[PDB]
Amino acid sequence: GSSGSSGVAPLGLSVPSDVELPPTAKMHAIIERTASFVCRQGAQFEIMLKAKQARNSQFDFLRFDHYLNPYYKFIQKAMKEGRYTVLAENKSDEKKKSGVS
Incomplete structure (x- = not known):
């Protein structure tokens, strides 16, 4: 009911x-995507x-003084x-998506 866990993780x-x-899906996506x-x-x-991107914040996980240091370094190394x-x-061996023209 009350309390529990927070944050998004893969499968x-x-x-x-x-x-x-x-923190949220946004940051989570940026990390993996960047990795x-x-x-x-x-x-x-x-x-x-x-x-x-020294001023950018979305790439803060790169900072050694960040909490996403291990998260990003992990997803990347993996x-x-x-x-x-x-x-x-x-691969797929099936019909693939198409690009907008």
């Missing part, structure tokens, strides 16, 4: 009791972002290690 991914969850890009584009990506996946980015 397949099993986060331990050492990492903290995101996939930083993992696909390369480590250098994180630099360009942390550099250019996505690159071959544990975390984002949508169907490999």
